[PDB]
């Protein structure tokens, strides 16, 4: 019962090199380098599914801060005023209204200014 390895080992190597397309040099041609690069690309992707949630909230807060300062208030007082006024809109939607509907954002600032005063 002698088993030759030609068909199975070729299909295993071809599966890795298909995932290594677009990589530079031996990282897309050579199996020893490509396998090593596909594992690192999976570690980065696992890490950046956590980092993607951090970077978007960083982008929403920076946009809320800029549009709130156009109305005479900082970020930290605008968030405190919306919590006191029982408004439960999250930072994704607030930064989206701050770009696309600017007078509806003005209505939220005046709501937050009333709850602080």
């Amino acid at each position: 019962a002698r088993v030759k390895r030609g068909v199975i080992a070729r299909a295993r190597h071809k599966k890795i090199l298909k995932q290594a397309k677009g990589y530079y040099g031996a990282r897309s041609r050579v199996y020893r380098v490509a396998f090593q690069a596909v594992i690192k690309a999976g570690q980065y992707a696992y890490r950046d599914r956590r980092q993607r949630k951090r970077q978007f909230r960083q982008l929403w807060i920076a946009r809320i801060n800029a549009a709130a300062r156009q109305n005479g208030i900082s970020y930290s007082k605008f968030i405190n005023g919306l919590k006191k006024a029982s408004v439960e809109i999250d930072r994704k939607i607030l930064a989206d209204i701050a770009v696309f509907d600017k007078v509806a954002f003005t209505a939220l600032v005046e709501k937050a200014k009333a709850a602080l005063a």
Partner: protein
Amino acid sequence: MYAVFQSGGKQHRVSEGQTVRLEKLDIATGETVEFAEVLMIANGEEVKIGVPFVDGGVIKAEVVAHGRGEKVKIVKFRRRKHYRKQQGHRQWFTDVKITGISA
């Protein structure tokens, strides 16, 4: 005219006719959903800000599809320590089509 409602632990800004992808709902395909927890309704500089909810505000939508999302590959690797393991994942969703924002 848009509105803001919460569903599936997340919030969405939708309008009439728009197709929105949510988390999985236990509703059959073709059945109507109602969202009574509406957070804000804006219609041409008349803004109803809910405190937390615009009461009297309901969003109606029609379930059009279920399905699983694109496969995500999960890779864990610890160098020089003889450890790796791998895992796949597909996430369920529900597509709804917004039919009425009634303030």
